[PDB]
Amino acid sequence: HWGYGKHNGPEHWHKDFPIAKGERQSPVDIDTHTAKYDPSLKPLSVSYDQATSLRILNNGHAFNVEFDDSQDKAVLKGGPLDGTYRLIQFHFHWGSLDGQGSEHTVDKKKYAAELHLVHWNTKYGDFGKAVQQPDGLAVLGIFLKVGSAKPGLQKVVDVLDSIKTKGKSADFTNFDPRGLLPESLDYWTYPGSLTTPPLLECVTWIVLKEPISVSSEQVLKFRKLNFNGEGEPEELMVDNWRPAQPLKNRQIKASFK
């Protein structure tokens, strides 16, 4: 099954998931001179005051920090969205070196990593239903560049040594995802997909223009994770990103001028 290596990576996914070559795939390159400022877009509403993190899991592709999504405790609303989307998990995509790692690009620039806060539309009742719908998910994408440390990232990076290999999880309560946000909520938005199999076309992408800064030491610790299971030959978890996909018949809108 699928992964990020030469033999099972993005160029192979279409064989088991033919939607890989569909009309609304992600990620995409954001051409900042083609995206149109849309003065009808609202400010995002990111309501994470009551967020309840539970657990962190190495799933063999990335690590997910999971939230209690059994009530409306951490929600994304506003922006291009209608209705209420509950945070279920966040995760990252990152590179073997700082010059690559992000899935979205900005005028072809790749950032060192990209954070995805994944939310599902409550009008569909559960995540498995939501991913069957064109407006089922909203993913908030945040670029990471390497410079100064991100203080609110450090609790994530210090637990990584305890979930080194596929299938390992650890308690991860009381984490505040508001410490992963940049200062500005200006964003681009377009209709797309999950960037991992099954690649379903159910996502409203909201990608923030302002990257967060993380330290070289912080991203080095991401790169010490493993794709493999315990006791298996070591395969460092690096380069777990899908490259940019054709934009096709889609328009990327900017919330800012």
Ligand X SMILES: NS(=O)(=O)c1ncc[nH]1
What is the residue type of 170?
A
Residues designated as active site: 61
By C-beta, is 53 or 195 nearer to ligand X?
195
d(CA 227, CA 1): 13
Q: What is the closest distance, in whole angstroms, from the C-beta atom of residue 191 to ligand X in the complex? A: 13
Please identify the residue of the shown chain whose CB is closest to the bound Zn ion: 116
What contacts 128, CB < 8 A, 6 or more positions away?
none
Q: What is the closest distance, in whole angstroms, from the C-beta atom of residue 46 to ligand X in the complex? A: 16
Tell me which residues in 71-130 interact with ligand X (CB under 6 A).
Answer: 116, 118
* H or E element in which residue 13 lies: helix 13-16
User: Of 6, 62, 10, 7, whose CA–CA distance to 197 is shortest?
Assistant: 10
- Between the two ends of the chain, the Cα-to-Cα distance in Å is 43
* Binder among 113, 194, 225, 238 for ligand X (CB under 6 A): 194
Which residues is 76 bridged to in the sheet? 46, 85
119 is in an annotated binding site: no
Tell me which residues in 130-149 interact with ligand X (CB under 6 A).
Answer: 139
DSSP for 192-248, please give it. E--SSTT--S-EEEEEESSPEEE-HHHHHHHTT-BSSPTTSPP-B-----PPP----
Residue 237 touching ligand X (CB under 6 A): no
**Among ligand X, Zn ion, none, what binds residue 25 when CB lies within 5 to 8 Å by partner kind?**
none
Count of residues for the chain? 257
Residue 207 touching ligand X (CB under 6 A): no
* Binder among 24, 104, 110, 116 for Zn ion (CB under 5 A): 116
196 is in an annotated binding site: yes
By C-beta, is 133 or 232 nearer to ligand X?
133
d(CA 254, CA 257): 7
By C-beta, is 199 or 252 nearer to Zn ion?
199
Tell me which residues in 70-89 interact with Zn ion (CB under 5 A).
Answer: none
Residue 242 touching Zn ion (CB under 5 A): no
**Among ligand X, Zn ion, none, what binds residue 194 when CB lies within 5 to 8 Å by partner kind?**
ligand X
Q: Tell me phi and psi for residue 238, to 5 degrees.
A: -140, 155
What is the residue type of 184?
S
116 is in an annotated binding site: yes
By C-beta, is 116 or 168 nearer to Zn ion?
116
Q: What is the closest distance, in whole angstroms, from the C-beta atom of residue 192 to ligand X in the complex? A: 8
Residue with tokens 């440390």: 149
Note the residues at the interface with ligand X (CB under 6 A). 116, 118, 139, 194-196
Residues that constitute the known binding site for Zn(2+): 91, 93, 116
Note the residues at the interface with Zn ion (CB under 5 A). 116
